[PDB]
Amino acid sequence: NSVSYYRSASYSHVGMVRKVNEDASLDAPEAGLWVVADGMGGHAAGDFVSSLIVDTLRRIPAASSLPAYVGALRTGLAQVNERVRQEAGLRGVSVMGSTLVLLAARGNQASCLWAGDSRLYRLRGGVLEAISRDHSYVQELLDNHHPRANVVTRAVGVHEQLELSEAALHVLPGDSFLLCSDGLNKTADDSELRDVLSHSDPYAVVRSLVHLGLTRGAPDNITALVVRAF
Numbered sequence: 001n002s003v004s005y006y007r008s009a010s011y012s013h014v015g016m017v018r019k020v021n022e023d024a025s026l027d028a029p030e031a032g033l034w035v036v037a038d039g040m041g042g043h044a045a046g047d048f049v050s051s052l053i054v055d056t057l058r059r060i061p062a063a064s065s066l067p068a069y070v071g072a073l074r075t076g077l078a079q080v081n082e083r084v085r086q087e088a089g090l091r092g093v094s095v096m097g098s099t100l101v102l103l104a105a106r107g108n109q110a111s112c113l114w115a116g117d118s119r120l121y122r123l124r125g126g127v128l129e130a131i132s133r134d135h136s137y138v139q140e141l142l143d144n145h146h147p148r149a150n151v152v153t154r155a156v157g158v159h160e161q162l163e164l165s166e167a168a169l170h171v172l173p174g175d176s177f178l179l180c181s182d183g184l185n186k187t188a189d190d191s192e193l194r195d196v197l198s199h200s201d202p203y204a205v206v207r208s209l210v211h212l213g214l215t216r217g218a219p220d221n222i223t224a225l226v227v228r229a230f
């Protein structure tokens, strides 16, 4: 019952309103690493931060021990946070940051690190389950389609100390995972995500998710990254 192999695919689209894609992704199954980052601040700001995230995380050496790897990912994100803070302060801009959601896998164990309203879902036995929980003003109100949905309470470059949320996962053969920016779940509810994810091919699945989003007016940059365990 141990997990042998991870298949993955990613697809992003600027959408139907924005003309600059500030979404970024890293599809590195060769390092057991999958990342989606939703940049904010417009061109030369949001995409700057999201691309810096994916490039910094890509260069981290793939340590065999998942907990050590996760420690290294955390440190890399802290360094990205500090660099973005320095740059934003220098330019004097109000908005310069990016959400993050990553999944790192080693055999039968995986870890999710996230900050923002980019999500990780797990599909197991045809049942979809939200692993991450939005760092959003709305989510805090719900924990106690809302107009306060544009307020992200944690993301890279927002605060001095970046506080990442973490969730550990036991992976079974046949498990599926979806990393996405809010542009997808904003245009398809969780039951439709479960429907589209219930297919064998991650490449067709991510393209079908983005297509459904585009079909419903794609108000935001829409990115989907699907991982399947064997």
Ligand SMILES: [Mn+2]
Binding pocket: 022, 023, 038, 039, 040, 046, 221
């Ligand atoms: Mn964005």
Ligand SMILES: [Mn+2]
Binding pocket: 038, 181, 182, 183, 220, 221
């Ligand atoms: Mn977004």
